[PDB]
């Protein structure tokens, strides 16, 4: 199937309480594999998945060097953005960055990414062409000018199309036991009386991986999007995910309703009904 590698980074200032806290995590699809936290005892990038532990000491030394350099860069950039936005030095501010690559079953590059946000709003993003930028405002335009002057996009494109995809291929192989296994959802429907006139039918999907999944209710074969309560997909804590969808049905009309489930671990889409 298709796969992805993504790195996430967050720096948060805290005026009067030391230097900004920096946290970064790396994922393959929905599997967390490395982390680094500046507030940790002895900050070092640490392994979080069995298949990455084989990497040798030079891997961990170099990764750690990079992480530390990103923390310092963010600290300088947080000051820079205070100037760009004519802001006081009294408040807490946030800088976020995500980069990575997506590949198809054949292992070739499908799309690359590199984007930044300031205080939770889009700041600047490398376009899908991996050669041009989208700036959100005149502040981000100042960064764009500097990045266009330093040929930054050229640097990112090289990485994204080369190293990023090659690391992904390597990790997929070393972690094939888990990274290339899709766990299908375990599904069932529950009935919860609301009043003598109605009850909720709740369709459950449990123990699945990866996270992507579609759950829908139909009434007489008609989608009930507007009348369905759909909770966000949530982590179970053991690598797998959970999700449910619910609809309010009048007493005795339970059989007009059907739950539909699509997941990559299922050869055919599922159809379920409440069973008294």
């Amino acid at each position: 199937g298709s796969h992805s590698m993504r790195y996430f980074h967050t720096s948060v200032s805290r005026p009067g309480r030391g230097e900004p806290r920096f946290i970064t995590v790396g994922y393959v699809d929905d599997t967390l594999f490395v982390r680094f936290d500046s507030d940790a005892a002895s900050p070092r990038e640490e392994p979080r998945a069995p298949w990455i532990e084989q990497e040798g000491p030079e891997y961990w030394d170099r990764e750690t060097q990079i992480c530390k350099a990103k923390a310092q860069t963010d600290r300088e950039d947080l000051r820079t953005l205070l100037r760009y936005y004519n802001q006081s030095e009294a408040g807490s501010h946030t800088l976020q960055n995500m980069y990575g690559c997506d590949v198809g079953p054949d292992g070739r590059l499908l799309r690359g990414y590199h984007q930044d946000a300031y205080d939770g709003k889009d700041y600047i993003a490398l376009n899908e062409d991996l050669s041009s930028w989208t700036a959100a405002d005149t502040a981000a335009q100042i960064t764009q000018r500097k990045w266009e002057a330093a040929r930054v996009a050229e640097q990112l494109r090289a990485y994204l199309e080369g190293e990023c995809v090659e690391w992904l291929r390597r990790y997929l192989e070393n972690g094939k036991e888990t990274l290339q296994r899709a766990d299908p959802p375990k599904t069932h429907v529950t009935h919860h009386p609301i009043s003598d006139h109605e009850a909720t039918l709740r369709c459950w999907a449990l123990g699945f991986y990866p996270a992507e999944i579609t759950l829908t209710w139909q009434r007489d074969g008609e989608d009930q999007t507007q009348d369905t309560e759909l909770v966000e997909t949530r982590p179970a804590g053991d690598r797998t995910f959970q999700k449910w969808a619910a609809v309010v049905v009048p007493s005795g009309e339970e059989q007009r309703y059907t739950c539909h489930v699509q997941h990559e671990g299922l050869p055919k889409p599922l159809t379920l009904r409440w069973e008294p």
């Binding site: 790396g26 990764e63 990079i66 350099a69 820079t80 953005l81 590199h114 500097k146 640097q155 690391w167």
Partner: peptide
């Protein structure tokens, strides 16, 4: 493995 070039805003 991460991208290693430092790029100041």
């Amino acid at each position: 493995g991460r991208f290693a070039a430092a790029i100041a805003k």
